[PDB]
Design an enzyme around this catalytic site. Structure first.
Site, mmCIF file in Angstrom:
data_model
loop_
_atom_site.group_PDB
_atom_site.id
_atom_site.type_symbol
_atom_site.label_atom_id
_atom_site.label_comp_id
_atom_site.label_asym_id
_atom_site.label_seq_id
_atom_site.Cartn_x
_atom_site.Cartn_y
_atom_site.Cartn_z
ATOM 1 C CG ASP C 150 -1.907 -1.145 1.243
ATOM 2 O OD1 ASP C 150 -2.534 -1.427 0.194
ATOM 3 O OD2 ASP C 150 -2.054 -1.770 2.321
ATOM 4 C CG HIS C 177 -3.721 -5.244 2.505
ATOM 5 N ND1 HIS C 177 -3.455 -4.274 1.561
ATOM 6 C CD2 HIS C 177 -3.432 -6.429 1.918
ATOM 7 C CE1 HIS C 177 -3.024 -4.846 0.453
ATOM 8 N NE2 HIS C 177 -3.000 -6.153 0.643
HETATM 9 N N1 LIG Z 1 -0.937 -8.567 1.186
HETATM 10 C C1 LIG Z 1 -0.671 -8.230 -0.085
HETATM 11 O O1 LIG Z 1 -0.330 -7.080 -0.377
HETATM 12 C C2 LIG Z 1 -0.806 -9.208 -1.094
HETATM 13 C C3 LIG Z 1 -1.200 -10.524 -0.817
HETATM 14 N N2 LIG Z 1 -1.345 -11.488 -1.826
HETATM 15 C C4 LIG Z 1 -1.770 -12.871 -1.444
HETATM 16 O O2 LIG Z 1 -0.643 -13.791 -1.424
HETATM 17 C C5 LIG Z 1 -1.203 -15.129 -1.469
HETATM 18 C C6 LIG Z 1 -0.457 -16.029 -2.448
HETATM 19 O O3 LIG Z 1 -0.418 -15.297 -3.680
HETATM 20 P P1 LIG Z 1 0.372 -15.841 -4.974
HETATM 21 O O4 LIG Z 1 1.764 -16.187 -4.599
HETATM 22 O O5 LIG Z 1 0.113 -14.852 -6.052
HETATM 23 O O6 LIG Z 1 -0.454 -17.256 -5.273
HETATM 24 P P2 LIG Z 1 0.063 -18.586 -6.115
HETATM 25 O O7 LIG Z 1 -1.071 -19.519 -6.299
HETATM 26 O O8 LIG Z 1 0.823 -18.138 -7.299
HETATM 27 O O9 LIG Z 1 1.080 -19.349 -5.120
HETATM 28 C C7 LIG Z 1 0.693 -19.615 -3.791
HETATM 29 C C8 LIG Z 1 1.705 -20.600 -3.190
HETATM 30 O O10 LIG Z 1 1.175 -21.054 -1.899
HETATM 31 C C9 LIG Z 1 1.311 -22.501 -1.878
HETATM 32 N N3 LIG Z 1 0.367 -23.225 -0.951
HETATM 33 C C10 LIG Z 1 -0.928 -23.503 -1.095
HETATM 34 N N4 LIG Z 1 -1.328 -24.178 -0.016
HETATM 35 C C11 LIG Z 1 -0.283 -24.326 0.799
HETATM 36 C C12 LIG Z 1 -0.151 -24.921 1.997
HETATM 37 N N5 LIG Z 1 -1.234 -25.490 2.523
HETATM 38 N N6 LIG Z 1 1.021 -24.951 2.647
HETATM 39 C C13 LIG Z 1 2.131 -24.342 2.049
HETATM 40 N N7 LIG Z 1 1.971 -23.730 0.805
HETATM 41 C C14 LIG Z 1 0.766 -23.737 0.212
HETATM 42 C C15 LIG Z 1 1.087 -22.912 -3.329
HETATM 43 O O11 LIG Z 1 1.626 -24.225 -3.565
HETATM 44 C C16 LIG Z 1 1.870 -21.849 -4.067
HETATM 45 O O12 LIG Z 1 3.260 -22.193 -4.129
HETATM 46 C C17 LIG Z 1 -2.675 -14.954 -1.907
HETATM 47 O O13 LIG Z 1 -3.557 -15.116 -0.774
HETATM 48 C C18 LIG Z 1 -2.741 -13.535 -2.422
HETATM 49 O O14 LIG Z 1 -4.083 -12.994 -2.321
HETATM 50 C C19 LIG Z 1 -1.050 -11.115 -3.147
HETATM 51 C C20 LIG Z 1 -0.651 -9.808 -3.412
HETATM 52 C C21 LIG Z 1 -0.519 -8.822 -2.422
HETATM 53 O O1 LIG Z 2 -5.745 -8.857 -4.287
HETATM 54 C C1 LIG Z 2 -5.065 -9.737 -3.717
HETATM 55 O O2 LIG Z 2 -5.379 -10.939 -3.535
HETATM 56 C C2 LIG Z 2 -3.682 -9.321 -3.252
HETATM 57 C C3 LIG Z 2 -3.683 -7.980 -2.507
HETATM 58 O O3 LIG Z 2 -4.064 -7.869 -1.346
HETATM 59 C C4 LIG Z 2 -3.111 -6.793 -3.246
HETATM 60 O O4 LIG Z 2 -2.700 -6.929 -4.418
HETATM 61 O O5 LIG Z 2 -3.054 -5.689 -2.667
#
Ligand SMILES: NC(=O)C1=CN([C@@H]2O[C@H](COP(=O)(O)OP(=O)(O)OC[C@H]3O[C@@H](n4cnc5c(N)ncnc54)[C@H](O)[C@@H]3O)[C@@H](O)[C@H]2O)C=CC1
Ligand SMILES: O=C([O-])CC(=O)C(=O)O
Ligand SMILES: NC(=O)C1=CN([C@@H]2O[C@H](COP(=O)(O)OP(=O)(O)OC[C@H]3O[C@@H](n4cnc5c(N)ncnc54)[C@H](O)[C@@H]3O)[C@@H](O)[C@H]2O)C=CC1
Ligand SMILES: NC(=O)C1=CN([C@@H]2O[C@H](COP(=O)(O)OP(=O)(O)OC[C@H]3O[C@@H](n4cnc5c(N)ncnc54)[C@H](O)[C@@H]3O)[C@@H](O)[C@H]2O)C=CC1
Ligand SMILES: NC(=O)C1=CN([C@@H]2O[C@H](COP(=O)(O)OP(=O)(O)OC[C@H]3O[C@@H](n4cnc5c(N)ncnc54)[C@H](O)[C@@H]3O)[C@@H](O)[C@H]2O)C=CC1
Ligand SMILES: O=C([O-])CC(=O)C(=O)O
Ligand SMILES: O=C([O-])CC(=O)C(=O)O
Ligand SMILES: O=C([O-])CC(=O)C(=O)O
Lengths: 314, 314, 314, 314
Positions: C150, C177
């Protein structure tokens, strides 16, 4: 009453193939093997309301249990082409996959029929044969290189051009399964069909390059999968019907052959309880087709040797 | 002679669904639509030696041409579940997909049978109907939430327990298509089956969480695909038969209903030339079954309202 | 010489995040955990010419080993949004994931800093905390909800409007967030910047729905990955400098706070050797920003409660 | 202030590559290009708090505008290896891609530094050179085959064996980028190291087949991505530093060469404002190393010939 195993059951081909097999009242036991995703695919298919009990198997440790008591083994396991590749560019990768998987069949279901889909079929059947030899269980009447999709395509294209029902069309396709080794015997087509040499040349090219047409149309998303699942199922059904004592079952497939100077060749085959009951040979052909056969043999021999050479290096 | 469209044809469900359709002699034309990969899927399928002409369409501009002249439209398009998710968690994603594609059907093939696979069915069907209402062409006898896989599962599990042939087993399943809204009427099973309570309870729960069971097994590779293809094809063929005049075709399906106080509900339906000939209703149920229906109405009503609300907010 | 664990390292965020950590001289041991693909990722990173030793762990059996002796733990694990989805739709899946992983952290590396990326952050941090309270090792100064993206976004959006060097810009961002809970304090921006109200509205709107604009642009291919890898790395670097002893290190993060009636909140935190040195609090705000804070409390409270109430069901 | 283009920016290499580039103040404009997904990658990166102006481009129609006014073009666009494949099995596919992208570079940014990552590098650089020759803008000082990862691996393995910090190790690697052609000059290492011949041959083997090892470790999930993003970013940074007049910047790379009878060859390069300032040459080598060079030459010649011959077919 038949037990069928699919090795590579989680792939583009593997999954729809396993679906068609599950749907069939010929199959009573369907075992599914792959290195990835098999248990999910198995749980999915097990819900279908047919008699075939489905079971999934994951990793080389579980391959033996999968193959136990199998009447038939089909092998789509392998890497498919990308646009630009020839079938031969997949050789190094698929040779290894085929050798490992056929070895297990040799050890755990040597009496089973082996249907190799993985490419190039021109080399992977020789590999399968030698691997079976190396475990002292070789039976040339039970090892099939699945070329059925070539026939299926030939039928479709000739049906389209003449306005026929493609269920009533039958085109023998002989030789091998790559480029100019694919030889459509339009002169043996039932029903008889007359083309000028103009169109007959394009039709032949269309059949030969059909696999590449599809790869181009998928733009990097693989090769023929759904049609191959249809052709693979068709061949397995023919085989299993023959093994139940159905008479007059004929399919072209790439096998151990006496019909030419090539030790492996595809011709129409009478299938029966033995597997290959009788090889029906090339039969009567046109000059144009005779010509194509002569040109194909050089390339065919290279591919067979390449496969035998690979088994030596294990 | 049936002309069938598949919207979402490139997905896990849509590809094998398209294959089953292409294989069927009931289908004379198969038009495929997706936002990606469609022309490769059509090219592949176009080589299968059956009569149905296959055509692929890609992107919004081509959607009206996919739908024109269609008798049946199947809509498997939508995002599948990951482990942990409920079907309701897909709502916001799939509501827009389903609204858009059904708006196109309402516009371009208003007289077709519309078969919605896209989850959550308990909500996406109400969306479909409200879209057809805003276009002034709502016929509730032609709009079907496909619940057929719940029936296919029930048949399989019952047969597995009693050692029957699943082809001969028929379990009506009512309510909706999510958890406790799935109500298998084992008391109406043909043949009549008697289970000790502990088995009857475990069977009933297994049927209800069957989809969730498959999502777990697939570990993030998606939801049921091959068995859903089987189920949707079965449903489409039933519909087509009934359209061809076949008598006594009965399928359960989540439709506009006045059998309970829920505006939409799944029960057995006699199909005829114009879709639903007669809703056969709940019929006589056991108290156990009576209790699940009472327990399901609150959840069903909420999911219906949720869907209706979405079309309101536009 | 910080020992960092990345739980969810094979993912879209996890991989590039792991790359940024491997690239830092601050990291001496990089342990990578996932349920799939982790050996290939670890092998890949191990070839990079930095001193950090890389080790890859696969499946819950190897999860304890991965966490042994760790100083900081990063949890990008989880499931990303699809177009149309809200962060709340992922709750069911991701809550189970975070709870399971933070349960092992609590068991095996209780002293470590725990940085949760997995959404919804507004709920997942309370879960983490209640899981740590349950094992009797809850240290509220060591558990961080990574809101950094953010801030990073805000800096960039201010700089594009004022044609400034985004490196020199710092906008603090408070609250939570998700949507309206993300409160960019433009009035406290260094350097000071003057916008009319309409531009201040649209700018703040952009910061709040930035995640969703990226989910839309990726059009099915997931949510932010690369910029979250950056934002995650920055926070881990900030955190680690302070642990080595660097003075004046301030980062906004979503933690246990007493500044408002919300028991969890994001404000500028002075970091130190033991985690949080001092919560610097909201500070001086404008009328516009006080309106947004008060409007946000109800939504935060609910998300806080959903997270807390989820751990009770375990 | 450098304007970098990435072609194949959505791939496994491209995305982390693009990230590292966006994180550098050396880059003022980062134009990203691919046939799929680039808008969402661009949006993701556009949120990072650095000065680089990020811009997405999609499909051959937008390619020209991606390339206008670029200083450096990096081309990871291509198909990666599966287990068992050699880099050369990709030639047929990746030749076409490289020829088409470099063709556009020759028309739209002929003065830019062209860095080809796409495999097999031994043939793709010749392809680029000849495509540039066809459009009359060939400058051999500006075309680079990124071998950098070979050096990064050499540094790391040597540094692991001698308990050194790998940031203070430099092994020159020469020849080409495939199997035996990768020749790490361990005798020219700084700081000086000496291994017994048995350890030295193993080390050399490990470096030569390192790419194949990562492929093996990834079990079909692709080839080295994160390390290659590191190695490629490093190279672009060196090249941009030199373009800004920095001195003492030396990188190995596969380029037009007369240091051997191979028309292309990799040796350490002094980089300056025109690209290649001076080829530093092979230098003084051990018997072991001289022997490897002699053995390598025929393979490089063939790979170079293959690439040249391809461009003659266009
Ligand atoms: N707080 C933030 O600013 C942001 C948060 N996110 C969040 O990050 C999270 C993951 O996002 P991405 O990496 O893009 O998804 P992705 O699907 O590309 O990868 C997620 C990873 O988590 C693993 N995973 C699933 N279940 C698991 C488990 N039970 N134990 C260990 N690993 C497990 C998967 O195998 C994969 O390697 C999502 O919830 C997304 O919404 C994404 C962007 C920003
Ligand atoms: O939208 C999502 O799942 C990831 C998130 O929180 C962001 O990109 O700020
Ligand atoms: N003979 C013919 O007419 C045709 C042959 N093919 C060939 O079929 C093969 C498979 O094609 P697709 O299924 O589309 O590829 P795919 O990539 O979609 O799936 C391949 C499957 O093989 C599996 N596999 C790889 N190694 C394995 C192993 N060691 N043990 C068990 N499973 C393993 C993979 O896990 C994957 O599930 C390709 O080589 C293709 O060239 C394709 C079309 C027609
Ligand atoms: N009712 C039932 O019994 C069952 C329903 N399903 C549902 O079917 C849906 C599809 O599942 P899968 O095929 O496994 O998922 P998938 O991800 O494999 O395929 C989804 C398909 O929908 C397409 N799509 C997405 N947006 C589209 C759009 N705007 N216009 C046209 N096509 C679009 C995608 O491109 C893709 O082809 C999911 O909602 C799933 O929950 C799955 C099993 C059973
Ligand atoms: N020289 C080296 O040290 C190394 C080279 N490589 C090579 O890098 C190349 C790319 O590898 P990855 O990114 O991992 O594979 P990937 O499949 O993850 O990347 C493919 C990318 O190339 C793009 N692409 C394909 N055709 C394109 C076209 N015609 N125009 C624009 N983009 C196109 C795809 O859309 C995708 O974004 C491969 O050839 C691989 O062998 C990989 C590692 C090291
Ligand atoms: O071309 C391929 O890779 C698969 C094949 O053999 C065919 O489609 O006929
Ligand atoms: O669970 C899902 O997402 C698909 C579904 O409806 C089922 O399998 O019954
Ligand atoms: O092996 C591959 O395909 C990529 C490569 O050249 C390497 O990792 O060195």
């Amino acid at each position: 009453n038949a037990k069928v195993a699919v090795l590579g059951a989680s792939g583009g081909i593997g999954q729809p193939l396993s679906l068609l097999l599950k749907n069939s009242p010929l199959v009573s036991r369907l075992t599914l093997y792959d290195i990835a995703h098999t248990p999910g695919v198995a749980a999915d298919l097990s819900h279908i309301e047919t008699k075939a009990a489905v079971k999934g198997y994951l990793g080389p440790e579980q391959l033996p249990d999968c193959l136990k008591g199998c009447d038939v083994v089909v092998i789509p396991a392998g890497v498919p082409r990308k646009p630009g590749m020839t079938r031969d560019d997949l050789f190094n990768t698929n040779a290894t996959i085929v050798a490992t998987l056929t070895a297990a069949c040799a050890q755990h279901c040597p009496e089973a029929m082996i249907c190799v889909i993985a490419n190039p079929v021109n080399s992977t059947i020789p590999i399968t044969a030698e691997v079976f030899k190396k475990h002292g269980v070789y039976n040339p009447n039970k090892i099939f290189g699945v070329t059925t999709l070539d026939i299926v395509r030939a039928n479709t294209f000739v049906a389209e051009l003449k306005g026929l029902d493609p269920a009533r069309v039958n085109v023998p396709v002989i030789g091998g399964h790559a480029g100019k080794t694919i030889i459509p015997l339009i002169s043996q087509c039932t029903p008889k069909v007359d083309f000028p040499q103009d169109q007959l040349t394009a039709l032949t090219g269309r059949i030969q390059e059909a696999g590449t047409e599809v790869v181009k149309a998928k733009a990097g998303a693989g090769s023929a999968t759904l049609s191959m699942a249809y052709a693979g199922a068709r061949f397995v059904f023919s085989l299993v019907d023959a093994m139940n004592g159905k008479e007059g079952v004929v399919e072209c497939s790439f096998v151990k052959s006496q019909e030419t100077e090539c030790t492996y060749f595809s011709t129409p085959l009478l299938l029966g309880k033995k597997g290959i009951e009788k090889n029906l040979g090339i039969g009567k052909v046109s000059s144009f087709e005779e010509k194509m056969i002569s040109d194909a043999i050089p390339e065919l021999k290279a591919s067979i040797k390449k496969g035998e050479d690979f088994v030596k290096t294990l």
